[PDB]
Amino acid sequence: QFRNRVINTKSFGGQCRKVFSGDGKDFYRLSGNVLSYTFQVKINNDFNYE
């Protein structure tokens, strides 16, 4: 299970680090220290009829 908040994910460090989500068609502000955050999509589907 995921437990409680350990890391501050929103310390912007005074940077204006915009990313355009592309997906979601909006701009989001990343924290100054996150190594990456990206929005390419994957989908997986499996059917088993029997």
Binding site: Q15, R17, G32, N33, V34, L35
Partner: protein, 50 residues
């Protein structure tokens, strides 16, 4: 006197299909400049801290 009649009909049908696709659609290409590349601040900070 004996009389006898028999009629046995049988069938076995077996039907199958398989279908597979792998289609790839490129929609943009890029080439990075060779020089004066502007590094990201998180990478620059990691290099500086080395």
């Amino acid at each position: 006197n004996s009389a006898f009649k028999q009629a046995i009909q049988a069938s076995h049908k077996k039907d199958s299909s398989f279908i597979r696709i792998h289609k790839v659609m490129k929609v943009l290409n890029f080439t990075t400049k060779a020089k004066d590349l502007h590094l990201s601040d998180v990478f620059l900070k990691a290099l500086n801290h080395l």
